[PDB]
Structure formats: C-alpha cells, structure tokens
C-alpha cells in the first residue's frame, strides 16, 4: 500500500549534499527560510511522485533524495 | 591640444633661450645633420624602392582587422575617427615601406611595420587623459580561479571531488596548500 510507519522496515536518508547546495543557492540571492523550506519540500514531493509512479500505490529497501532531484526543483 | 603644463613651459622655454645662448638646439648627445647633405642622403634613400616582406602580411592584415573593428564600436563614441578605411591600411603599408627605405633594406621588418602601427596609434588617444591602468599583476589565487573558470567553460560543474583541478594546479606550479585555502574561500564564497 505504500503506507509508512515511523511489509519491510525500510530506512530513508536525506542526502545533506543536496541540502548543502540548496542552502548555498538560497543564501546567495536571498537567504530566506521560507524559500529554502519550500524548495526542499518541492524536491521531496518530486522524489515522492517518482517513487509512487515506480510502484503505483495510488491515493486511498532504502530511500534517498539524489542531488538531481533538488537540482530540478531549484532550477 | 596644448595642455598647459609646467615642465613644458619650463624646458621648452629654457631651451629656446638656450638657443639664444647656443644657436644649436643639439645638446651634449646629438648629431645634427646639415640640410644639404641631409637632403643628399634622403634622395639617395628615395632612389631605392624596397620590397614588401611576405611574413609581416598576416600581422599587417590582422592589424587592419583590429583597426577596423574597434572603429565601429568607436563611431559614435569619444574618439570619433569614423570607420578606418582600406586607405588607412594602404597608408600603413606605405609608411612601413618608407621606414624600410630608411633602413636602406629591400625587406620590410616586423619591427618596421610595428613602428608604423605605433605611429598610427600615437596619433590616437592623444586627446585626453593619456593614461591607462593595470590590475592583473597579483593573481596568487585569482589565477587559480581563472583556471577553474576555463574548466567551467569546458563543463560547468561545482563538484565535490577535485582531481583534474588539482592536477592542473600542480601543472601550474601553485602548491596544494594555497589551492586548498582558495577552495575553502570559494566554497565559503558559495561557488
């Protein structure tokens, strides 16, 4: 079902390098908490929809967030 | 344009008065030639007809190109000498040929045509300021930065693993401690 509870115990890593690059880019032009939070959320949900599509859970081993996700979401 | 200065009105005036004292402007180091035998040598030179050297052409050509392009971006600008013409190129060639006559040599030198270019450009920028500046001397880390910029022109990545960068730095001779310092600075500088 794709449900998550904080049937396999999966783990997830939020690669702090993409976080680094997003922080760098935002601190460059503006350095705003709202913008940074929102772009992080954006990349997160992009990876989310890709993972959903790859398995098709609909709406009723180990996960990560590559640099490429935040690259797209920020561009 | 006679900029009213002080050292000019000093030296020029002094030396005119010195002419009144000593009727020869030539000072301690000078070889003035009487106009008669001067004329003699000059005509002798005029009876030579040297030849254009084949090597300089490209350079000459390139000079023209330069003297062309700037002219366009200088048309409405300050130095409003408009759109240097092929006659300017031909005049440069003629000046080079005459200097080669002064060499009494039948092949024009690269220094010859370079002197001609110096003449044609000294005619210019003699209007105002007559000065320039230099900034790129230091370059103890900015040089590394420019090398990085060429590399970025190649690909354009802000990677987290530098192996061709360190190789090119070592080829450049700059040490790795200064390189790592600069990398620190630019990462903090957010690039």
3-class secondary structure per residue, chain B: CCCCCCHHHHHHHHHHHHHHHCCCCCCCCCCCCCHHHHHHHHHHHHCCCCECCCCHHHHHHHHHHHHHHHHHCCCCCCCCCCCCCHHHHHHHHHHHHHHHHHHCCCECCHHHHHHHHHHHHHCCCCCCCCCCCCCCCCCCCHHHHHHHHHHHHHCCCCCCCCCHHHHHHHHHCCCHHHHHHHHHHHHHCCC
Considering Cα of B97, then B103, then B104, then B110, what sign does the dihedral take? negative
**Residue A39 CB partners (closer than 8 Å, separation 6+):** A22, A26, A70, A73, A74
- Contacts of residue A17 in chain B, CB cutoff 8 Å? 160
Cα–Cα distance, B174 to B143 (Å, whole number): 10
3-class SS of residue A64: coil
Listed as own residue / partner, the contacts of A7-10 with beta carbons closer than 8 Å and 24 or more positions apart are A8/A61, A10/A61, A10/A62, A10/A63
Nearest to B117 by CA among B99, B104, B143: B99
Environment class of residue A24 by beta-carbon count within 10 Å: exposed (0-12), middle (13-18) or buried (19+)?
middle
Cα–Cα distance, A27 to A25 (Å, whole number): 6
Residue ranges of the binding site of B for ATP: 87
Environment class of residue A42 by beta-carbon count within 10 Å: exposed (0-12), middle (13-18) or buried (19+)?
middle
3-class SS of residue A53: helix
Whether B92 contacts B121, CB under 8 Å: no
Nearest to B98 by CA among B113, B111, B79, B110: B113
CA atoms within 13 A of residue A12's CA, in its CB half-sphere? 10
Cα–Cα distance, A11 to A13 (Å, whole number): 7
Cα–Cα distance, B56 to B89 (Å, whole number): 13
In Å, what resolution does this model reach?
3.9
Q: Which of A16, A22, A24, A25 to mutate to test the interface with B (most CBs of B within 10 A)?
A: A24
B residues 140-169 closer than 8 Å to A (CB): 158, 160
Nearest to B174 by CA among B183, B187, B156: B183
Cα–Cα distance, A48 to A46 (Å, whole number): 5
Structure tokens at B173: 């001779």
3-class SS of residue A59: coil
Report CB contact under 8 Å: B190, A17: no
The angle subtended at Cα B68 by Cα B62 and Cα B73, nearest 5°, is 130
- Contacts of residue B190 in chain A, CB cutoff 8 Å? 24, 27-28
How many contacts does A have with B, using Cβ atoms within 8 A?
5
Report CB contact under 8 Å: B160, A24: no
The angle subtended at Cα B163 by Cα B159 and Cα B168, nearest 5°, is 110
- Which residue has 């959320």 as its token pair? A41
For residue A62, the cross-strand partners are A11
CA atoms within 13 A of residue A38's CA, in its CB half-sphere? 6
- Contacts of residue B160 in chain A, CB cutoff 8 Å? 17
Structure tokens at B45: 């030179």
What method was applied to determine this entry? Answer: cryo-EM
Nearest to A46 by CA among B99, A54, B126, B46: A54
Answer whether B122 touches A (CB < 8 Å): no
Whether A17 contacts B160, CB under 8 Å: yes
């Amino acid at each position: 079902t794709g449900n998550a509870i904080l049937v396999r115990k999966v783990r997830l890593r939020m690669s702090a390098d993409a976080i680094e690059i997003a922080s760098r880019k935002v601190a460059s032009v503006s350095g705003d908490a709202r913008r940074a939070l929102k772009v992080c959320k954006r990349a997160a949900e992009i990876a989310e929809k890709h993972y959903m599509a790859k398995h098709g859970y609909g709406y009723d081993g180990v996960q990560t967030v590559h640099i490429t996700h935040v690259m797209k979401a920020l561009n | 344009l006679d900029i009213p200065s002080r050292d000019d009105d000093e030296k020029l005036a002094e030396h005119v008065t010195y002419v009144h004292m000593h009727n020869k402007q030539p000072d301690l180091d000078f070889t003035p030639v009487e106009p008669s035998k001067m004329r003699e040598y000059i005509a002798y030179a005029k009876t030579k007809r040297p030849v254009m050297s084949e090597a300089v052409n490209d350079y000459v050509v390139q000079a023209y190109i330069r003297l062309r392009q700037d002219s366009k971006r200088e048309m409405d600008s300050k130095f409003s000498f408009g759109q240097a013409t092929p006659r300017t190129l031909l005049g440069i060639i003629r000046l080079s040929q005459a200097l080669a006559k002064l060499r009494l040599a039948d092949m024009v030198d690269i220094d010859d045509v370079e002197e001609a270019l110096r003449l044609v450009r000294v005619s210019k920028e003699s209007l105002y300021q007559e000065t320039n500046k230099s900034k790129e001397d230091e370059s103890p880390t900015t040089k590394i930065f420019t090398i990085i910029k060429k590399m970025l022109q190649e690909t354009g990545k802000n990677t987290l693993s530098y192996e061709n960068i360190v190789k090119t730095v070592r080829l450049r001779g700059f040490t790795m401690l200064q390189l790592s310092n600069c990398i620190q600075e630019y990462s903090y500088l957010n690039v």
